[PDB]
């Protein structure tokens, strides 16, 4: 296999730069770097190669990888190769990857559109490997830069993956039957469309509303304002899906599906031994949803009730309330009102400023071991 | 077998009021649960169950269990058995178990003394047997009362069991050749002792300083400071064990050996995505010790310094200068240095206020599956 050859050599180098991080911007270690790429058999032929050769040899004068992403940008090929430092996906160092992309509804495509790219990893370098790295985002890159029409990347091959080892689990477990009827059986191929779909909905909603990110990001890392944000942007794709009626619907039911049982099931028992960001808004929306009559709890069931749909959007408009203000308040008391609104419906423990998973969940990640 | 029986009769009436924890201090629901109790043919005729019936018949005019904690603190028998509510233990509802006792070295329990229960479980009802419940502390009962002479129990079996399916291979694969020769190979009953020793010296050390808990508790309950203080009390516990001449030599290196594996090693990789508080303390160690001489890296190798010894009591020492400072400013402001120390030696992220594992830890978790 050609790809491979080029992988082993990706790898081999990535091996030799690991413990020399801190060196990642030094001009010595760059110019070494480059050096080493363009002299490796089989990946130094390669045009993203020579472009990421060229970005690190002028990276004293122009730090940028601005050859590397102009080719990834305008899709030169199907492979990613670039030195990437990212806090959150710490086996990334030395990297290579090469994807195909999904089929998209052109409606989708066309009313959501978004710099987003749904693909199936076909073939990549150790630290891609990793089941953290679900995505590649622009400033994932050593620059650190990204610009609003900059490509992201999710890898939907891993979401599949996640969906079928701890969703459908959750589901047989944890529903009432009949819950997610196209959901079951489906098969990889169907909950593909599903996954592409969601993430196509949740890049574009992230940049609608009246505290879009990445305008208003510094203002939501704090653990639950990253969840909240993370549920506003799904939320308002699963109410999409509900209703825009120029999407197919069949499909668009599918992702509504796929959406919420996700959001309800696998993040909701995210993080050991406290809730991640994620599990914390889904554990708000659990406990909302539960106390408006959007579900029931029948003998530690999940019942969706018909009047979801009402609920879904009650619970939006609610976040877009406490949203709004920022027209007429700080950015600091948003951020207190959605830190307020989060601890109404979540177990949070005001002397160690952080969160627990609430009684439902803990239990079911006892009983599931997830 | 008797005991099978009554934990067999323990387990299905935690089965039954499973979905009642908010009316575990309601007495018409108390009422209930203990006639139920007196009627399990097995499980009501042992004096603990006879104790715990006549707690939960008169709760509604003294909350609390002191007839079962006067028999468990008086050790009139090896059951343990209670209604029980601790957020952090949340498999814990209505609970059976028996234990035996270890042996105890005179002068570790007589100069370190406090009411420490090193304990194996032999047999046990369903919310004992999570993981997570690693201890019994006097507070987890329902009546969430504390006495400082209350039995405190600590589960020996389970750091066995953890300390052979995390520490040993992370030894094997991340310390210096020689590092740790007393526990090379050592058996279940070895590290059993170690383990004991350890416990002993943690619960004494908590007590003892110019913030001990639980005076100080609401202090140091932020993630970084209840990490902090877990490490200000094993250290103390590792410098005992090299220091107190009075201490059995064999016992006391392996005791030593054993508290430095599992704060250098074990603790360092819990939680994910990011450390929980141990692993933020453990982290601030294995900072702490490169920068200062007492640890070193080679080849991604931990080699322990022979200078360790004189390095923990810097860092020690450290930590009780920061402390010393209650006698002359507040309480918040002593928060403050310690987390300022903390936060110089770990990977904080000042927008989402909270940590990341460092790069080294994090690559042995994905290297290793911890
Ligand atoms: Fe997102
Ligand atoms: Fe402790």
Request: aromatic share 10%.
């Amino acid at each position: 296999s050609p790809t491979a050859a080029v992988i082993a050599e990706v790898d081999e180098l990535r091996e030799k730069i690991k413990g020399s991080r801190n060196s990642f911007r030094d001009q010595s270690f760059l110019d070494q770097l480059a050096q080493h790429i363009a002299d490796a058999p089989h990946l130094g032929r390669q045009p993203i190669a020579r472009a990421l050769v060229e970005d690190l040899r002028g990276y004293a004068s122009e730090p940028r990888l601005a050859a590397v992403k102009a080719h990834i940008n305008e899709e030169r090929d199907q492979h990613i190769f670039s030195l990437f430092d990212a806090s959150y996906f710490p086996s990334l160092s030395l990297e290579y990857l090469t994807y195909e992309t999904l089929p998209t509804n052109p409606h989708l495509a066309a009313r959501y559109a978004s710099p987003t790219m749904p693909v199936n990893i076909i073939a990549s370098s150790k630290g891609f490997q990793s089941r953290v790295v679900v995505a590649l985002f622009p400033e994932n890159h050593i620059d650190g830069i990204q610009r609003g029409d900059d490509l992201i990347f999710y890898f939907i091959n891993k979401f599949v993956e996640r969906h079928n080892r701890i969703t459908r689990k959750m589901i047989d477990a944890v529903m009432a039957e009949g819950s997610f009827p196209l959901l079951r059986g489906a098969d990889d191929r169907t909950v593909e469309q599903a996954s592409s779909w969601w993430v196509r909905l949740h890049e574009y909603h992230h940049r609608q509303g009246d505290m879009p990110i990445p305008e208003f990001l510094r203002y939501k890392k704090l653990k639950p304002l990253a969840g909240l944000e993370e549920l506003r942007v799904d939320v308002s794709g699963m109410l999409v899906c509900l209703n825009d009626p120029e999407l197919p619907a069949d499909e668009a039911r599918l992702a509504y599906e796929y959406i919420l049982s996700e959001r309800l099931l696998r993040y909701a028992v995210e993080g050991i031994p406290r809730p991640n960001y994620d599990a914390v808004a889904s554990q708000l929306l659990f406990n909302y949803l539960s106390e408006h009559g959007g579900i029931e709890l029948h003998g530690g069931v999940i019942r969706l009730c018909p009047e979801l749909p009402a609920v879904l959007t009650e619970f939006l408009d609610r976040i877009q309330r406490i949203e709004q203000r920022i027209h007429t308040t700080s950015a600091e008391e948003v951020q207190q009102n959605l830190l307020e609104f989060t601890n109404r419906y979540t177990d949070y423990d005001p002397d160690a400023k952080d969160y627990r998973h609430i009684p439902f969940f803990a239990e079911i990640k006892e009983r599931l071991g997830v």
